[PDB]
Design a protein around this nucleic acid. Structure first.
Lengths: 196, 377
RNA sequence: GUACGUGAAAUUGCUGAAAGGGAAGCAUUGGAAAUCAGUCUUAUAGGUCAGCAUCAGUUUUCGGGGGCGGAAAAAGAAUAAGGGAAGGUGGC
RNA sequence: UGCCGAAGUUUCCCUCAGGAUAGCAGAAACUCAGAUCAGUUUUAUGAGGUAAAGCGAAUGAUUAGAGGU
RNA sequence: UCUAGUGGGCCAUUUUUGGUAAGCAGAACUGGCGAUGCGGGAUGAACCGAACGUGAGGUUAAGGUGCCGGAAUGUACGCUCAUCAGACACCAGAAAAGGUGUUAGUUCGAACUAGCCCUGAAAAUGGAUGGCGCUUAAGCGUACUACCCAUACCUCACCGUCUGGGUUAAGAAGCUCAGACGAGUAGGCAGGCGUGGAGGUUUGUGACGAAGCCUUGGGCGUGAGCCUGGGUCGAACAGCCUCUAGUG
RNA sequence: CCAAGACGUUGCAUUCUUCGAUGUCGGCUCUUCCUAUCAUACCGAAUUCGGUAAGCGUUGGAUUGUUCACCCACUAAUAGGGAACGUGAGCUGGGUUUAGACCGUCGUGAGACAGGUUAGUUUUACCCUACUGAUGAAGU
RNA sequence: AUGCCGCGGAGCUAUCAUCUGCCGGAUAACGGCUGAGCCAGAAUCCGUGCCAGAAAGCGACGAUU
């Protein structure tokens, strides 16, 4: 257990409910949480079943003024926020104030692409679903129910990945130089019996 | 026991007054880099409307190669002045205006757009912008380079020379026109080189194009459900009134539904009427613009006595097939059609035989005063 | 000050304070702000709140040593025998 | 504020939206006493015709042959 | 011995009658509700646990521990893929028969027998395992620990009632020790609080301000209520013992 | 479901609420939902029958107060059902409809008739909400 | 209580007059491919198109007493 000022979570390969439950508990603990790459979130069950579930969600509306009726957000970040909102006591000022500590986004915008992004093992698809079980991605589900910025995020994410890769090569070179100069120091053996 | 379809469309409500007087182009044609750089919109003023006689060259029709009479709408379209450019960058949340570059010199007509009270103001708009444009063009150059490098959509700010039209209004109408065709670099170069210059509708539209006309319809004020929604009039025996909807809902749900006809504003709404052919783009200077080839009789588009409540059209005009939204002297937006169309009706060439310029302020009987003096003793 | 003793509540205006995202009011607990009293001040003894120590009562939570019981646990180890087969080791 | 705390059931009534009556219940007492008792068990001993069981037992209903006529 | 209230009942278990059926009518035994809060069943008069004075600490029942929600995103072995899966008794409802579904079993490749799933299955505002969601479950079956918390249980403090033991050295109508117990409608009884008037009493209060009135002030009592500071006011009023009633 | 679609078999009155009052049928008007599909679209089986499918549509008249009904037409077709048996501060008042009156039957009579027949006052929104339009303070 | 009659511009208005009203994607039924996955296929669903613009969503820009 550890407390960070803000936690940026790479939502790739995570399960919607498992991550939303972990995030919702952290928000109620008073911690600010940022969730990036919401279009890569996974849901158990094949897509068609998930698509039918969301079409059932679209059916809910007020018989008078659907503008009062339930607002069905299509963006993957908004889907994740909806799952978290159903896990927070949002009608209450405590659970409402815990919502503005959550910022779910699609892709990794500039303020967060230069920050460490941790993952939640309790919500990872590889560690939770038996192999061979069908699953869908929220990004593809959103693109079929109305979300219309799928390929823009894909292009911007590809460009960001290239830039991040170039940074990593620079960091690898610097760390390689540090490691090479590390062993030359005689203290490396003077620290050996201490376990360092 | 019986059925009847719904009265009215549910896709047009709320039936509230438009929040804008000038039509907003809500969609622009898909950008094709193969096509050359061009404008995809224009802004004119509804002068009036008249009727023409045309030989119908549609094979297989019952009236092929025989005369027909069609009502046409004349819109005065003096050339628009390109005063600026604005860049749009695509984002995961939509288009975002990255930056805007204005021309060095802006006319008084477009400057009046920025003031509610131009008379009392010191007319100080864009003064410091003009100063920085003259003293340091490098900042402008960086702005244009930024548009070329990051922006994926380019729109030219254009205003209309409203002082050329016979209108008491002096604020020039200003809009953004998306520039499709070519690379973003080509669009910026086209925009910058066209700062402070004028673009004529002859360059944009080609005398047969199917365009969309966008404008705010004529306001009818508040109306009842009989007129606003077309419901049936209740019988003469009705108590407390008959020009209304009898039942406004069932017991449950215990509310009036949004789908029930009610009274209120019926008019002054934003419409985008599709598939309007240009029958003729006439030049202002030419004195034979309304005269066809089978008619001779050198004459102008303006009927005798002038366009009712508009005056005399002296500038470039466009003659469209059928009606357009809005009253006379209303600002209308003509945009290129978004859909493709290969119909024989949409592709047949148009060759007019005669254009009516008798007085519309009554029952006109003479086309021109020259033959009016002939008939009258 | 005759619209006259006292001049209540409903209701109302002004001022000050605070609250208010489709009711309000209420109970418990504390924060914040406001407000206030006891108490001491004194006659070795005494005011308010704290920290530890040694005890008592209640309870909770970790650990150690020992006795007895069982097929006087079952197993196992080391070391002597007999017999056995394999899902067959070396040798074929 | 403190202590105790129900009934919708019996019998009769031109009774069936009500009374009287017995029960439940509250106060006030009086006696009795290791007694006289218990919504209990045990030991001893009675009583009953329900569940089941039966139709090659009475009565009642019903299946099938074989024998003796 | 005298008297009140009641003399419309209702629900659940099991047994059962009339009825095509019923949240139907009528009975028998017991427990509940009416009269009864509290923890759990999302919610609910009678379902499950448990019955209640004011509090502190500890521990539990029924039920639960992914989030909402206090408490293991525990352990072990399995089954299930559902194009609108499943999710805890009462209970919010479903069948025969089926399956080139799958996991097992039984008997001679075959017939089967069993679980889960699917089909059978078929409505009207948008919508309910309580919601979110959940798929080597956060589903289903079984075992196993740890943990969560009721006004229940346990130790303790205090309040009251009742009960028993002391008290000629202590408003003896007093003092003192000890134990048990605490739900309540209709109803009963006891002791108190407050209002108007009468007898007695207080060397009683008062124009140096009685009574009354207002008060983001202070104190007392379990409570009815009482006392008091500040302001307003202007001629009377109260405590104790008893009497009385057009007394809340 | 079963094999000779017969025979079987399995499924999709009560009096609890209201008598200090919930306006009582039909039509007209207007909206919405369901599918158990009349037409249209898409395939599949020999002008005839099914599957997905409720997107869109589903009429004009004669009689009758009628919901059902029945007729003459048209139509691609003139499917069915829910909405407090949708809809009276929405309408009309034809059915129902107290008092007037007539007839038939019944009664000694007053009267009765779930038989017929004519005439017979249909109140109120300015409140809250909802809906329909119209302004509008304030972050930046 | 617009005396009446003919015509009557302007405005309003008439399916009594005129104009205008389309192609993308995933699919259900169902047919295939290889041996799940993919392809084909409806007036269906979802988007382009169209209307509103969050009065407590947002950006660019102009001038700044």
């Amino acid at each position: 257990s550890e407390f960070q000022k803000v936690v940026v979570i790479d939502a790739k390969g995570h399960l919607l409910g498992r991550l939303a439950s972990v995030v919702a508990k952290q928000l109620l603990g008073g911690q600010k949480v940022v969730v990036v790459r919401c279009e890569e979130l996974n849901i158990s069950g094949h897509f068609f079943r998930n698509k039918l579930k969301y079409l059932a969600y679209l059916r809910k509306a007020c018989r008078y003024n659907p503008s009062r009726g339930a607002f069905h957000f299509r963006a993957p970040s908004r889907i994740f926020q909806k799952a978290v909102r159903g896990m927070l006591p949002h009608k209450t000022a405590r659970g409402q104030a815990a919502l503005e500590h959550l910022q779910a986004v699609e892709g990794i915008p500039p303020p967060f692409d230069k920050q460490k992004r941790v993952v939640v093992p309790a919500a990872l698809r590889v560690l939770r679903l038996k192999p061979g079980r069908k699953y869908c991605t929220v990004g593809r589900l959103s693109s079929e129910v109305g979300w219309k910025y799928n390929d823009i995020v894909a292009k911007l994410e590809e460009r960001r990945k290239v830039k991040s890769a170039a940074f990593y090569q620079a960091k690898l070179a610097k760390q390689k130089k540090i490691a090479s100069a590390k062993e030359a120091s005689p203290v490396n053996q003077k620290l050996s019996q201490f376990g360092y | 026991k019986f059925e009847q379809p719904r009265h009215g469309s549910l896709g047009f409500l709320p039936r509230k007054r438009a929040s804008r007087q000038r039509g907003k182009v809500k969609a622009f044609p898909k950008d094709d880099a193969s096509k050359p750089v061009h404008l995809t919109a224009f802004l004119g003023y509804k002068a009036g409307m008249t009727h023409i006689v045309r030989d119908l060259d549609r094979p297989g029709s019952k009236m092929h190669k025989r005369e027909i009479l069609e009502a046409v709408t004349v819109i005065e379209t003096p050339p628009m002045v390109v005063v600026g450019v604005v860049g749009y960058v695509e984002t995961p949340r939509g288009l975002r205006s990255l930056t805007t570059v204005w021309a060095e010199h802006l006319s008084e007509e477009v400057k009046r757009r920025f003031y509610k009270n131009w008379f009392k103001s010191k007319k100080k708009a864009f003064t410091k912008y003009a100063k920085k444009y003259a003293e340091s063009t490098q900042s402008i150059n960086r702005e244009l380079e930024r548009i070329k490098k990051y922006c994926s959509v380019v729109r030219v700010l254009a205003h209309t020379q409203i002082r050329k039209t016979p209108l008491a209004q002096k604020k020039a109408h200003l809009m953004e026109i998306q520039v499709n065709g070519g690379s973003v670099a080509d669009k910026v170069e086209w925009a910058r080189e066209h700062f402070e210059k004028t673009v004529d509708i002859k360059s944009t539209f080609e005398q047969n194009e199917m365009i969309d006309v966008i404008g705010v319809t004529r306001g009818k004020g508040n109306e009842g459900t009989t007129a606003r929604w077309g419901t049936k009039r209740l019988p003469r025996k009705t108590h407390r009134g008959l020009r209304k909807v009898a039942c406004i809902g069932a017991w449950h749900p215990a509310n009036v539904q949004w789908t029930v006809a009610r009274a209120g504003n019926a008019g002054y709404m934003h419409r985008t009427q599709l598939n309007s052919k240009i029958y003729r783009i006439g030049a202002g200077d030419d004195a034979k613009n309304a005269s066809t080839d089978f008619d001779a009789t050198e004459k102008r588009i303006t009927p005798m006595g002038g366009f009712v409540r508009y005056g005399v059209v002296e500038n470039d005009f466009v003659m469209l097939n059928g009606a357009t939204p809005g009253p006379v002297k209303r600002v209308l937006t003509l945009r290129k059609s978004l859909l493709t169309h290969t119909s024989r009706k949409a592709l047949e060439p148009v060759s007019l035989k005669w254009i009516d310029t008798a007085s519309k302020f009554g029952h006109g009987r003479f086309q021109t005063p020259a033959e009016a003096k002939q008939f009258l003793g």
